[PDB]
Amino acid sequence: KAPSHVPFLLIGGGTAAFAAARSIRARDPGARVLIVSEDPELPYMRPPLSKELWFSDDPNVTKTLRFKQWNGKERSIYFQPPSFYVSAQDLPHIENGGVAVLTGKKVVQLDVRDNMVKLNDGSQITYEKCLIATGGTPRSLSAIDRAGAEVKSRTTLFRKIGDFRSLEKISREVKSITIIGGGFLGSELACALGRKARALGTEVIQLFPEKGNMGKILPEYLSNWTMEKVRREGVKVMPNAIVQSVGVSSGKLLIKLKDGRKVETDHIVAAVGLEPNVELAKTGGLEIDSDFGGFRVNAELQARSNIWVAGDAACFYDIKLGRRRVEHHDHAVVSGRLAGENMTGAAKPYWHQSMFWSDLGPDVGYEAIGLVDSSLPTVGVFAKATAQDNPKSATEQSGTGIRSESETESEASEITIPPDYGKGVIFYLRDKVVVGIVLWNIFNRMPIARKIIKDGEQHEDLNEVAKLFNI
Ligand SMILES: Cc1cc2nc3c(=O)[nH]c(=O)nc-3n(C[C@H](O)[C@H](O)[C@H](O)COP(=O)(O)OP(=O)(O)OC[C@H]3O[C@@H](n4cnc5c(N)ncnc54)[C@H](O)[C@@H]3O)c2cc1C
């Protein structure tokens, strides 16, 4: 089925590859683009898998994957209808070109000098320009790694459609599920599973070594508030939990913690970060970053004269922060688009400041930008929330749940300071300069946050700065 040659080859069929395909076709209306995708699905967005797809009373949603946004309006998880793609066989000579996807196929060898890749089925494909957009593989716990096949078979590493379907099934079938990891994803899943368990009368546990949810990122006040929110959903949250081992004890999973607590459960979900998919660097002879992970690229996202990297797999040069890798939807879209533009001769640098967002449900959301690390000095400024300061209202206003879309990618032109907390802004500092911002239930203000960080001025009074965020 695979053609012998394609002008544009995109390795991996995720968010970054789809953005690049769209960019290439916009700039070159007759372009011929092939996406090679190891997963059996056509390109789709990930955020709904831990969010709106769980907030449903319709059993058909697991089959269609057409979810309802917080505003009640339906959207498909897929970036475009399957009929918008051309067949890989037709690609070389179909009038006006198109975008094809080879699903269920892995690129296993990259030969840079020969502009060639080899698939797992032995197929050889040459390219003129290549994007690596392979994303990452979920990290496991060493305690699970060392526990043997039975424990492993009863642990979900949450990333794909397949994991959504298998976990949604498990949540209807078993009595107890344990999430390991306190980050945004672990916490989203805790809230999603918690809501399911309430209707079924079952148990959800979330455990992590930090003092509270998102403890590596949020300062203690807001980390603690989040833990209480998750507890209000019915979830048993266990902070200061260091996993010693995991075994099977008369049919149940048994998690032993260093402090002496034991946790008995039916299934485990791990959400403890990501290992960038860099296997192709071996045969490709490409440099990887041993400190931050990922393929090292220049300002234009090039690994080689005709090889670019975008999305989760890229270790890029952040304009403010230096060598960096992120796991942001926004980054995958903007870096993928830019790769596509540069593959069609734009030669433009990656200067975008990537934003991140998380919704715990329709009532609580976060946004983040820049260097966000709870070990840094911070200043938090908080206020009571208004009726509009929640993900649902933000989605009602914008028409979308993908916040990188509603926020805009832009930075504000100017930021003239105007002359039971439920929202706020948190500034992360270096010598009175703001290097990162977290927004709690404040929407449509990311351009202001980008402007503050880009300008890099010293600020005498952060309480004045907070007025820009309507605090
Ligand atoms: C459940 C979940 C929820 C998330 N929610 C948010 C959110 O709310 N906000 C936010 O900012 N970010 C969120 N993220 C992160 C965001 O989704 C990612 O940053 C984004 O998916 C990265 O896109 P990508 O194209 O780089 O990688 P991916 O989407 O991982 O795509 C990579 C693809 O390449 C395939 N592949 C790998 N190797 C090969 C190979 N050799 N040959 C062929 N194919 C290969 C993989 O199977 C995969 O399909 C979430 C992530 C997850 C998993």
396: CATH: 3.30.390.30
Opening angle at CA 388, ends 15 and 55, nearest 5? 50
Residue pair 69/3 in contact by the 8 Å Cβ criterion: no
Whether residues 38 and 57 share a domain: the answer is: no
Burial code (b: 16+ CB inside 10 Å, e: under 16) for 322-346 equals: eebbbbbbbbbbbbbbbbbbbbbee
Residue 329 known to bind ligand = yes
- Alpha-helical (H) ranges within 44-108 are 61-64
For 427, the token pair is 């500034």
Q: What is the whole-number distance in angstroms between the Cα of residue 190 and the centre of ligand 1?
A: 20
Whether residues 311 and 412 share a domain: the answer is: no
How far is the C-alpha of 35 from the C-alpha of 232, rounded, in Å?
44
Residue 273 known to bind ligand = yes
Whether residues 245 and 325 share a domain: the answer is: no
Domain count, the chain: 3
DSSP 44: B
Q: What is the whole-number distance in angstroms between the Cα of residue 383 and the centre of ligand 1?
A: 35
Whether residues 169 and 114 share a domain: the answer is: no
DSSP 448: H
Resolution as reported, in Å: 1.8
Select from 216, 239, 271 the last residue of a domain: 271
Residue 232 known to bind ligand = no
Residues with CB under 6 A from ligand 1: 11-17, 36-39, 46-47, 49-50, 106-107, 133-135, 158-159, 185, 277, 311-313, 327-330, 332, 356-358
Opening angle at CA 358, ends 352 and 362, nearest 5? 135
Q: What is the whole-number distance in angstroms between the Cα of residue 278 and the centre of ligand 1?
A: 14
Element (H, E) at 463: helix 462-465
The protein residue with its alpha carbon nearest to ligand 1, atom 27, reads 135
Whether residues 204 and 230 share a domain: the answer is: yes
Residue 51 known to bind ligand = yes
Select from 292, 326, 350 the last residue of a domain: 350
Those residues with Cβ within 8 angstroms of residue 448's Cβ, 6 or more apart along the chain or in another chain: 412, 415, 468, 469
Residue 216 known to bind ligand = yes
Domain span at 264: 46-78+139-271
CA dihedral 312, 314, 315, 321 (to 10 degrees): -70
Residue 301 known to bind ligand = no
Whether residues 248 and 322 share a domain: the answer is: no
Residue pair 366/357 in contact by the 8 Å Cβ criterion: yes
Whether residues 342 and 369 share a domain: the answer is: no
Residue 16 known to bind ligand = yes
Whether residues 151 and 63 share a domain: the answer is: yes
Please state the atom number of ligand 1 nearest to the C-alpha of residue 404.
11
Q: What is the whole-number distance in angstroms between the Cα of residue 108 and the centre of ligand 1?
A: 19
The protein residue with its alpha carbon nearest to ligand 1, atom 30, reads 135
Q: Give DSSP secondary structure letters for 229-288.
A: HHHHTT-EEE-S--EEEEEEETTEEEEEETTS-EEEESEEEE---EEE--THHHHHT--B
Whether residues 459 and 368 share a domain: the answer is: yes
Whether residues 204 and 66 share a domain: the answer is: yes
The protein residue with its alpha carbon nearest to ligand 1, atom 53, reads 159
Please state the atom number of ligand 1 nearest to the C-alpha of residue 39.
47
* Side-by-side strand order, sheet with 355-361: 355-361, 364-370, 433-440, 423-430, 378-383
Residue 15 known to bind ligand = yes
How far is the C-alpha of 320 from the C-alpha of 337, rounded, in Å?
21
Q: What is the whole-number distance in angstroms between the Cα of residue 158 and the centre of ligand 1?
A: 11
Ligand 1 pocket test target in 6, 15, 36 with most atoms within 8 Å of CB = 15
Residue 282, class by beta-carbon neighbours within 10 Å (0-12 exposed, 13-18 middle, 19+ buried)?
exposed
Q: What is the whole-number distance in angstroms between the Cα of residue 25 and the centre of ligand 1?
A: 22
Please state the atom number of ligand 1 nearest to the C-alpha of residue 108.
41
Q: What is the whole-number distance in angstroms between the Cα of residue 312 and the centre of ligand 1?
A: 7
Helix axes 161-173, 184-200, angle to 10 degrees: 30
Q: What is the whole-number distance in angstroms between the Cα of residue 19 and the centre of ligand 1?
A: 12
Ligand 1 pocket test target in 55, 329, 405 with most atoms within 8 Å of CB = 329
Q: Can you tell me whether residue 399 is helix, strand or coil?
A: coil
The protein residue with its alpha carbon nearest to ligand 1, atom 9, reads 357
Select from 323, 350, 377 the last residue of a domain: 350
Q: What is the whole-number distance in angstroms between the Cα of residue 412 and the centre of ligand 1?
A: 29
* Side-by-side strand order, sheet with 295-296: 295-296, 314-318, 322-324
DSSP 164: H
Whether residues 204 and 131 share a domain: the answer is: no
Whether residues 117 and 216 share a domain: the answer is: no
- Cα Rg of the chain, angstroms: 23
- Alpha-helical (H) ranges within 174-219 are 184-200
* CATH assignment at residue 157: 3.50.50.60
Closest C-alpha among 310, 270, 437, 344 to residue 97:
344
Q: What is the whole-number distance in angstroms between the Cα of residue 14 and the centre of ligand 1?
A: 6
Opening angle at CA 40, ends 361 and 37, nearest 5? 100
Please state the atom number of ligand 1 nearest to the C-alpha of residue 310.
26
Ligand 1 pocket test target in 78, 121, 134, 338 with most atoms within 8 Å of CB = 134
Q: What is the whole-number distance in angstroms between the Cα of residue 134 and the centre of ligand 1?
A: 8
Closest C-alpha among 10, 160, 159 to residue 85:
10
Residue pair 167/158 in contact by the 8 Å Cβ criterion: yes
The protein residue with its alpha carbon nearest to ligand 1, atom 6, reads 47
